[PDB]
Design a protein around this ligand. Structure first.
Ligand SMILES: Nc1nc2c([nH]c(=O)n2[C@@H]2O[C@H](COP(=O)(O)OP(=O)(O)OP(=O)(O)O)[C@@H](O)[C@H]2O)c(=O)[nH]1
Ligand SMILES: Nc1nc2c([nH]c(=O)n2[C@@H]2O[C@H](COP(=O)(O)OP(=O)(O)OP(=O)(O)O)[C@@H](O)[C@H]2O)c(=O)[nH]1
Ligand SMILES: Nc1nc2c([nH]c(=O)n2[C@@H]2O[C@H](COP(=O)(O)OP(=O)(O)OP(=O)(O)O)[C@@H](O)[C@H]2O)c(=O)[nH]1
Ligand SMILES: Nc1nc2c([nH]c(=O)n2[C@@H]2O[C@H](COP(=O)(O)OP(=O)(O)OP(=O)(O)O)[C@@H](O)[C@H]2O)c(=O)[nH]1
Ligand SMILES: Nc1nc2c([nH]c(=O)n2[C@@H]2O[C@H](COP(=O)(O)OP(=O)(O)OP(=O)(O)O)[C@@H](O)[C@H]2O)c(=O)[nH]1
Ligand SMILES: Nc1nc2c([nH]c(=O)n2[C@@H]2O[C@H](COP(=O)(O)OP(=O)(O)OP(=O)(O)O)[C@@H](O)[C@H]2O)c(=O)[nH]1
Ligand SMILES: Nc1nc2c([nH]c(=O)n2[C@@H]2O[C@H](COP(=O)(O)OP(=O)(O)OP(=O)(O)O)[C@@H](O)[C@H]2O)c(=O)[nH]1
Ligand SMILES: Nc1nc2c([nH]c(=O)n2[C@@H]2O[C@H](COP(=O)(O)OP(=O)(O)OP(=O)(O)O)[C@@H](O)[C@H]2O)c(=O)[nH]1
Ligand SMILES: N[C@@H](Cc1ccccc1)C(=O)O
Ligand SMILES: N[C@@H](Cc1ccccc1)C(=O)O
Ligand SMILES: N[C@@H](Cc1ccccc1)C(=O)O
Ligand SMILES: N[C@@H](Cc1ccccc1)C(=O)O
Ligand SMILES: [Zn+2]
Ligand SMILES: [Zn+2]
Ligand SMILES: [Zn+2]
Ligand SMILES: [Zn+2]
Ligand SMILES: [Zn+2]
Ligand SMILES: [Zn+2]
Ligand SMILES: [Zn+2]
Ligand SMILES: [Zn+2]
Lengths: 182, 83, 182, 182, 182, 83, 182, 182, 182, 182, 83
C-alpha cells in the first residue's frame, strides 16, 4: 500500500493538480486502497471458497442463476467495465449452493481482465468443481473505455457466451437456457 | 346597506368587475351600469360591470363609499368599501 | 407453541436486546406462531386436499397455470425466499381443478425447503395424482440469504425447471410451454 | 454465538424436523451467524462512521440521494422487511460525503426496527451530524409479515416520510424533493 | 506523458501483476493517455469555446436543454462517475447556441470534480457568459465509488440542483423547468 | 381621479413598476416618466416606469397621494393610493 | 431548380466522389427537388390556408392539440432537426379547426429556422388569426448538428416554450396545459 | 473547402433567402465543413485503423457487439439516415478489440451510402481483417427521405442483415446471434 | 333505411366500382344500417335513460369515472374520431349510478359532432340531472380526418376540457381531478 | 365530384339532420372530396410508380421494411380500418428502393378492400416487379366495424400473413423475418 | 425618504431581514447595522440585517417610522413603514 500511495502521488502531480488542497490530501491513500479492492481476486482460491457446500441429490434438471452483478477492471486502459453474468448448469447428482456460484464470479471478475477471458474462466471453474453435464455462461458488459473515451458509443454493450458439455452438443438444451434468463 | 364588496381577477388594468350579489341595492347597480348573470354550475346570481376597477372606485366615492381595506385571495383582488 | 415461545425468548436476550420494553413483550408469542404458519405444510396430505376434484373429459390439450405465488423458508439459513411457480400439464382424459394445482404448491412450499428439491416435489405430486402424459414446473425465486447477507446481489434470481413425461421426450411440447407463460 | 446456536437447535426440534439429516447439520451455526449480521448495527456509532468526512464549501443548494437499499428485521414477528430509502438535505456551508449518508442507514436499519421509528432516527442522525437547514426522509418498504403470513396482501407497500427544518416550514422546498426523486 | 507512463508502471508492479505479458505491454502508455483525456478540461477557457455564438433576438421565454451526458472523474477515489445534466435558462435578449451549452459542460466535467462543486460551476459559467434572467442546473449521477467498492449500493443515484436568478426568487418559474425535463 | 394603483412583481427592490391603465392621467404619467406598451396576447394597454417601487411612492407623495393599503396577490405586490 | 441541380453538382465533385456512377446520376436532380420541399413554406400565407374555417360557438374552455410532428431545417449548418409541437389555446367565442392548427405549423417549420424563433412565430400566427384569450406553444426537438457532428450528444433534446395572453398572466391556466399534454 | 463554401452559397441564393442577414453569414463556411465531416471516411484505411490490436487467445466462442450507433448520408437525396448496427463474430484463435469493431463502422458509414451496400461492406471488412469462422451484421435505420419528404411514413424503419461463414451454413449459430442482441 | 340504401348505391357507382360483384352486393344495405347506428343518439332522452337511478346519500366527496370509450362521427368530413372520456363530479347529497354516467356519453357521442361541442354537452347534461357542486369533463380524441387525409399527422391527439361549478372557482379542486385520472 | 356531393346530401337529409346550419353547409363538398382521396388508388399503376428505381447489386441477403402505416376503407360497411404493414424480401441481384416498397402499399390500400385480399395483392405486386427469391407480407389492422358497431371488441386486431417463394419453402427463412420485425 | 420597506422569509421568529435597496439612506442602514450583498444571478444590490423582524421594528420606531400596513406575498411577509 505505501508503494501504491506514492504511485498515485506522481499521477496527481503530473496532471497539473495541486496535491496540497483539502480534496487531494487523502486521495493517494484512499484511491490506493480502492485499487487493492478491485484486484483482490488473486489471493482467493476455489477450494477455500466452496467451503464443502456441494450437496448430493438426485435432481438432474436445469439450474439457472441469472442477474449476477459483476464489476471488473479492464487491463488495456485500467478503466472499469460493469455488467451482468448469467450462469446455468446441469447437475450430475451433485448440486452446488446458489451463493457459491455468485462467489466464484467475485474471484475472477475482481482482477485485471478481458471479457473473452473472463467468460471462459468462470465456466471452467464450475466444470472443475462439480463435474456437471454442461455449463453455460453469458456475460453482458459496458466498457467505459468505449463510452467515455475514444469512440464514445454510450449505448454499446458487448455480450460474450461460453457453452460447455451438453450445452454445446445438444441444441435443445441451449434453447432452454436462453429462454428462462429472459 | 353600508358595506359593499368588489373584486377583479387576473389583472387589475382590465375588467370585468364583480359588484354585488342577489340581495344588493337595485338602484345602486343601475347607477353603476351593472348586468346580471349566472355562470353554469353556480347556484347564485351576481352583478358585474365591464369597467376596470379603478373607474368603479371613482364612481363609488361620489355616492359616499370609502375604501376600508384591500385583500388578495387566490388570483382575485378584493376591495371592501364602507359608506 | 410454548416451547417455541421460550425458544425465541433466548434469542432476544442473546442479541443484546431488552425483552421488557413495549415492542418486545408479545414478540416471543407472535413470532413463534408465525413459525408454525411457515412450516404448516407437514400436516397436510395430497388425498385430503384434492377433495375428489378430478374431472373426466376428453380434452387432451395443454393446460398451463402461471404466476402462482409461493413463499418458502430456506433450510440452511432459516431466512425466507419468495417467488413464482409456473406449472403446465397434458391431461390424459382427467382434468384437475385449477385451485388444487395451486393448493398442492401450498403443501410443499410451506416447509423448510431447498429450491432444487422444491421443484421436483410438485411435479411428482402432480404425476401421482392424475397420471398425466407430461408435467412441467418452472420456479423463479429470490433468496434473501443472497440479497441481505453474504454476497449481497440484490438483483439475482435463481430459476429451476423440471420436465417429466412427454415434456422431456418431445421437444415441440416443451417449446410451447415456455412460450405461453411469457 | 454458541447461545444462539443452541437457540435455533430447540426451534428445529420443535417444528417436527430432524436435525440429523444433511441439510440441517450446520443450520444452527449458519443461521445464528446470520442473525448477528442482521442486528450488527448496535455496535456502530455515528462518530466512528463519519470518519472526518464533512467538507466545507459554499454550496447551499439541495442534495438528494435516492434509491438507497435497506434490509431490516421487524421486531414484532422477527420476519424481514426490505425497501428503498430516499434522503435529501440542504447543506449549511458543510457538505457530507455521499457514502456516509448511505452508511448511516446501515447503522439504523440493521436493528430490530419499526418503520415509523426507523424513518425518524435517520433524519435525527443527519441533523445532529451536519446541522443542516433541513432534512427529508422517505422510506418505502414491503412487510413479509403482511405478504407471507396473516392478511396476505402481496402487493401492499407502506410509505413513511419525515421532514425536518425548512422542509417542514417551507412548502416550496418539499415540492422539489418529491419531484426529483421520481 | 512519460511521467504518467512510468507512474502506472509502478502500479502494475505493486498489485502482483506481470508487466511483461502481452496484455500489459502497452498498458502504461494507453492508460496514461486516457488519464489526460479525462482531465483535459483545464486547458480550455470559456471565451475560446463560445466562439462569438451569442445571438441577439427578442425571445424572452424559457429554453431547456435536457439529457446532456457527462462523464467525470471523482477526486477522492479517482474512480469515475457518470450521469446526465439538465440545464435551463431565461434569455435576456441574447440567446446562446445549443451546442455551446453542451460544450461548457465538457469543460467542467472533464476535471477532477465533486458533484456539489460540479453543479455550481456550470450555472456560474452560464451566468457570466450571457447575463440571463435565471439559470437552473440539475445533475444526476451514479458514483462507482459507491456501487463497486465500499457500501455497494448498485442502484443509488445522487441528484444535485442549482437555481440562480429568477429560478430562485420565483416559484412559478422553477415548477415549469422541473416539468418539461420529464 | 383620486384613486391610483401601482404594482410590482418578483422582487420589491427592482422595477419595473406598473402605474396605470388606458384611462389614466396623461400629465401624471408624464411627470412619473412612464412609457406605454402592450404585451403580446393582451387586449389592453398599460403604463410602466423602470424605477423601484419605493422611489415611485416618494414621487407620488409630493403630488398629494397617500397610501391607503397594500396587498400581495399571486407573485405581485399591489399598493392602493388615495389623494 | 436547374440552378440548384448545378449547385449540388459542385458539391459531389468537391468531396472526392464520382458523379458518373449509377448511384450519383440523378442525385443532383433528386436532392435539389428535396431542398425545395424542405423550404416550401415561404410561398404559403395564413389567409390562404385557414380557408374560412373559424367557427362561432360559445365554448370558452381549453383546447389542446398535442403530438404534432414537425420536421425543420436548421439555418446554421443546413442539417435537419425533427420533433413534436404542443399547442393549446383558449378560444374567445371563435373555435379554429383542428387541421388548420397543424397546417399553420407546416408553414413555419418548412423554412430555414432557429428553434427559439420557430416557437414564437406559431404562437403569434395563432394570436393574429383568432384573437384568443391565450396561446401556449411547447416544441421539443433533437438537433442533428448536436448528435451527428460536433459534440455528439445523441440523447440531448432541447425544449422551448412560449406562453401568451392569460397563459402568461394566470399561473393556474399554465399548470393545466402542462398536465393534459402528458 | 472554398469550393464547397461557394457551392452552398449558390444554394442559399436559389431558395429565395438573403445571405446577408446575421443567421446566414457563416452558413456557407459552417455547413461546408460539416459536409466534409459526413464524408471523411474515404481517407481512412483498415490497416491504419486496426493499429495492431488483434489478440491471440484460444477463445472460439461467440462475441456480439450490439447497439453501435451509425449516422450516414444517403446518396440519392443527400439527406441523412441514422440507426444502430449489430455485429457478431466467431473468432478463430484471434480476437479483435471491441473498439476497432466500432471504428470499422465509422469508416464505412461516414460516406455516401446505400443501406444494402453499407451492410455488406462491414461484414467483408471484418472477414478480411481476422479471417474468422463467421460474421453477422444487422443494421436498423430510419430514412429521412421517407419520413420528411415523399411518402411521409414517420414510423418506418428498414432492417438489413448479412451473414457470412458459419452464420450462413449453420442455422443453430444464427438463432443464437438473433437472441442475445434482444 | 331504403333511402339510405339507395344513397350509398350512388356513391359506389360514382367511384368507378362495380356494384355487381360479390363484395358489393349487400354493401348498400349493410353500410346504411351502420350509419343509423352511428347517429342513433337523436332518439334518446336524458329522462328515459337515467331510469330513476339517483341515490340519496351523505357522501360529498369526489367521484371520478375514467377511461370511458367514445366513438363519434365528425360532421365536417363524415369520418370517425375515437377517444376516451374522463368525467368527475362532486355530488351534493345525491349520487348518480356509475353506468348512467357512461350511458349519457352514448347519447351525445353517437351523433354528428364537433369535439368542442361534444365536451360541453356532457357536462351540461350532468349538471341538469343531479344539480351537483361541480362537474369536470376531459375528452381525448384522434381525428381520422387529420391522420388519414389532409395533413397526415398520425400521432396527433386533440384534448378538450370543460370545468363547471367549483371545479372552475376552486383551483385545489381541479388539481385533484387531474391527478387521480393519471 | 358533383354526383358525390349530391350523394352525401341525401344522407344528411335522411338521418334527421338539418343541412342548412353552419356546420353542415360545406359538408357535402368536403366529405365527397375525402371519399376520392380514400379511393384514389385505382388510377395508379405499378410501372408509373416504380420510376426506374430498381438497382443492380450483388446483395442477396434479407431486406425487411417494417412499420409501414396503411389506412384502408372496408368494402362491406364502408367504414375504415387502419394498421401496420411489414414487408420483407430476398433480392435476386436487383434491389428495389425503400420508398417504392411503401408507395406500392399506397396503391392497394387506398381502395375498397378486404384484408385477406389486401395482403395477397402487395406480395404479388412485389413478385412481378423484381422477380425476387421470396416475399413476405404481414398486415396488422383494427376494424372499426368491429370496435364501434356490432360486436364492440375495442381491443381486437386481426393479423394476416402471406409468404411466397423461399419464405414458404424454407422454414429457416421465415423464422428470421418474424424475429427482426419485433 | 419617508417610505421604507422591510421583508422576511420562511419564519418571522428568525432573520435575516431585508431593509433596503441600492438608493437607500446610508446613515440609516448604518444605524441598523446593515450589510450589503448581491446574490448570484441577480442584477441588483440589497441590504440585510441578521436580526429578527420584531427587533428591527423596535429600532425603526425610535427613528420616527410608523407601520402603515403589512402584507404576505408568496413565502415573504412585507411591512411598509412611513415616517
Ligand atoms: N441450491 C441451493 N442452495 C441453497 C439454497 N438455500 C441456500 O441457502 N443455499 C446455499 O446454501 C449454502 C450454505 O453455505 P455454507 O455452508 O458454505 O455457509 P455460509 O452460509 O456461511 O455461506 P455464505 O457466505 O455464502 O452465506 C450457500 O452457499 C447457499 O448458496 C437453496 O434453496 N438451493
Ligand atoms: N379446470 C377447471 N377447474 C375449474 C374451473 N372453475 C373452477 O372453479 N374450477 C375448479 O373447481 C374446483 C372445485 O373444487 P371443490 O369441489 O373441491 O370445492 P371448493 O370450491 O370448496 O374448493 P376451493 O377451496 O379450492 O375453492 C376447484 O378446485 C377449482 O379449481 C374451470 O373453469 N376449469
Ligand atoms: N458530496 C460528495 N461526496 C463525494 C463525492 N465523491 C466521493 O467519493 N465522495 C465522498 O467522499 C468520501 C470520502 O470518504 P473517506 O475519507 O471517509 O474514506 P473512504 O473512501 O474509505 O470511505 P468509504 O468506505 O465510504 O469508501 C466518501 O464518503 C464519499 O461519499 C462527490 O462527488 N460528492
Ligand atoms: N439556439 C439555437 N442554436 C442553434 C440552433 N441550430 C444551431 O445549429 N444552433 C447553434 O448554432 C451554433 C453555431 O456555432 P458556431 O458558429 O460557433 O460554429 P460551429 O458550428 O463550428 O460549432 P460546433 O462545433 O458546436 O458545431 C452552434 O453552437 C449551435 O448550438 C437552433 O435552432 N437554436
Ligand atoms: N374543432 C374541431 N374542428 C374539427 C372537428 N372535426 C373536423 O373535421 N374539424 C375541422 O374541420 C375543418 C374543415 O376544414 P375546411 O372547411 O377548410 O376543408 P378541408 O376539409 O378541405 O380541410 P383539410 O385540408 O384540413 O382537410 C378542418 O380544418 C378540421 O380541423 C372537430 O371535431 N373539432
Ligand atoms: N476484446 C476486448 N477488447 C478489449 C477489452 N478491453 C479493451 O480495452 N479492449 C480493446 O483494447 C484495444 C486497445 O487498443 P489500441 O492498442 O489500438 O489503442 P487505443 O486505446 O489507443 O485505441 P482506442 O482509440 O480505440 O481507444 C481497444 O481497441 C479496445 O477495443 C476487452 O475486455 N475485450
Ligand atoms: N355509484 C354507484 N353506482 C353503482 C354501484 N354499483 C352499481 O351497480 N351501480 C349503479 O347501479 C345502477 C342501477 O341501475 P338501474 O336501476 O337503472 O338498472 P339497470 O341495472 O338495468 O341498468 P344498466 O343498464 O345500466 O345495467 C347502475 O346505473 C349502476 O351504475 C356502485 O358501487 N356505486
Ligand atoms: N435500398 C435503398 N434505397 C434507398 C436508399 N436511400 C434512398 O433514398 N433509397 C431509394 O432511392 C429511391 C430514389 O427514387 P427515385 O429515383 O424514383 O426518385 P424520388 O426521390 O423522386 O422518389 P420519392 O418520391 O420516393 O422520393 C427511393 O425510392 C428510395 O427508396 C438506401 O439506402 N437503400
Ligand atoms: N377562490 C378564489 C379566491 C377567493 C376566495 C374567497 C373569496 C373570493 C375569492 C381564487 O380564484
Ligand atoms: N395573477 C397575478 C395576481 C394578480 C391578480 C389580480 C390582480 C393583480 C394581480 C399573479 O401573477
Ligand atoms: N412559510 C409559511 C408562511 C410564512 C412566511 C413568512 C412568515 C410567516 C409565515 C407557510 O407555511
Ligand atoms: N416572489 C416572492 C413573493 C414576492 C413578490 C413580490 C415582492 C416581494 C415578494 C415569493 O417568494
Ligand atoms: Zn479497456
Ligand atoms: Zn439460505
Ligand atoms: Zn412484523
Ligand atoms: Zn469517489
Ligand atoms: Zn444547426
Ligand atoms: Zn435517400
Ligand atoms: Zn372532420
Ligand atoms: Zn367492414
Amino acid at each position: 500500500l505505501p508503494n501504491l500511495a506514492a504511485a498515485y502521488s506522481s499521477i496527481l502531480s503530473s496532471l497539473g493538480e495541486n496535491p496540497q488542497r483539502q480534496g487531494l490530501l487523502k486521495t493517494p491513500w484512499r484511491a490506493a486502497s480502492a485499487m487493492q479492492f478491485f484486484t483482490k481476486g488473486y489471493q482467493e482460491t476455489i477450494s477455500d471458497v466452496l467451503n464443502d457446500a456441494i450437496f448430493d441429490e438426485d435432481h438432474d434438471e436445469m439450474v439457472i442463476v441469472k442477474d449476477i452483478d459483476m464489476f471488473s477492471m479492464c487491463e488495456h486502459h485500467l478503466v472499469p467495465f460493469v455488467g451482468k453474468v448469467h450462469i446455468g448448469y446441469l447437475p450430475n447428482k451433485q448440486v452446488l449452493g446458489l451463493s457459491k456460484l455468485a462467489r466464484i464470479v467475485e474471484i475472477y471478475s475482481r482482477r485485471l481482465q478481458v471479457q473473452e477471458r473472463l467468460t471462459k474462466q468462470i465456466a471452467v471453474a464450475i466444470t472443475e468443481a462439480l463435474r456437471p453435464a454442461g455449463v453455460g455462461v453469458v456475460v453482458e458488459a459496458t466498457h467505459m473505455c468505449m463510452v467515455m473515451r475514444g469512440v464514445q458509443k454510450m449505448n454499446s454493450k458487448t455480450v460474450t457466451s461460453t457453452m460447455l458439455g451438453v450445452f454445446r452438443e445438444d441444441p435443445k438444451t441451449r434453447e432452454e437456457f436462453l429462454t428462462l434468463i429472459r | 346597506m353600508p358595506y359593499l364588496l368588489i373584486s377583479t381577477q387576473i389583472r387589475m388594468e382590465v375588467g370585468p368587475t364583480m359588484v354585488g350579489d342577489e340581495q344588493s341595492d337595485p338602484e345602486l347597480m343601475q347607477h353603476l351600469g351593472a348586468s346580471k348573470r349566472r355562470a353554469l354550475g353556480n347556484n347564485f346570481y351576481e352583478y358585474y360591470v365591464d369597467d376596470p376597477p379603478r373607474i368603479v372606485l371613482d364612481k363609488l366615492e361620489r355616492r359616499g363609499f370609502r375604501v376600508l381595506s384591500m385583500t388578495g385571495v387566490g388570483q382575485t383582488l378584493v376591495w371592501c368599501l364602507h359608506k
